[PDB]
């Protein structure tokens with residue numbers, strides 16, 4: 001038949017809808033078999049993608065644009081409009097981004113992470129502040145940062161959205177999302193920065209498997225939005241034995257299901273991208289002059 005290899009992170013949310021696709025036979029319904037490939041982290045996943053070891057991974061539009069500008073035929077399809085969480089201790093003095101000055105701030109994904117680019121752009125626009133000049137920045141994978149924020153070695157951490165529900169149950173508050181930043185910028189609607197990244201070669205030679213997987217994913221998300229009972233089936237993959245954590249993860253996932261046409265998604269991405277590569281012409285590191293051509297999957 002046709003096998004589609006999806007690379008997934010152990011702390012990621014893509015494994016949730018992948019389990020729905022398999023359980024409900026939404027891959028079979030689309031003429032393919034989904035093979036979930038477990039990758040240990042984003043660095044390994046990006047290499048697996050560069051090495052052609054998977055047909056797709058989940059990633060961000062800014063990384064996708066960078067691979068496209070670097071010559072790759074990668075295509076992007078919206079995965080979620082829920083992205084990023086700046087977590088501070090409950091009761092923290094920190095009410096604004098200026099309060100990060102002097103703080104040990106964890107930043108998931110490194111200096112070029114999309115959530116960090118957004119947050120740095122916001123701090124420059126609203127306070128004329130370069131967070132890298134005032135905060136003690138510690139980059140790292142989200143699990144490590146969340147643990148060290150819990151242990152008190154970090155004063156704050158910019159993490160993936162799922163880590164909010166988890167930390168709220170342990171004494172932490174989400175001060176700001178990447179979605180909050182893009183609304184402050186003025187985006188027309190919910191912007192999907194997180195998407196499926198499809199291998200150019202798979203798009204060219206197995207385009208119907210790509211479309212079959214895209215349909216299977218949309219059907220899985222639709223099932224989770226329409227069938228509350230299905231969430232209890234996928235709970236083991238969510239690391240959510242705590243009830244408030246399980247409920248918050250569901251709420252934030254549902255709020256992020258993409259529900260706008262690709263044309264509108266593309267135009268918002270184009271404008272937010274063009275607004276990032278600015279901030280007093282700071283040519284923010286990680287951001288190219290413009291999006292590479294034909295990045296979005298039709």
Ligand SMILES: O=C(O)c1cc(C(=O)O)c2c(n1)C(=O)C(=O)c1cc(C(=O)O)[nH]c1-2
Pocket residue numbers: 007008009011012013014015042058059060080082083084085115159160161162194
């Ligand atoms: O910024 C975010 O909140 C966020 C969330 C998630 C997610 O939903 O797991 C991913 C990412 N970012 C991300 O950048 C990424 O590459 C990624 C991969 C996966 C996955 O499940 O395999 N999730 C995510």
Ligand code: NA
Pocket residue numbers: 072073074075198199200201
């Ligand atoms: Na590619």
Ligand code: NA
Pocket residue numbers: 029030215216219
């Ligand atoms: Na379908």
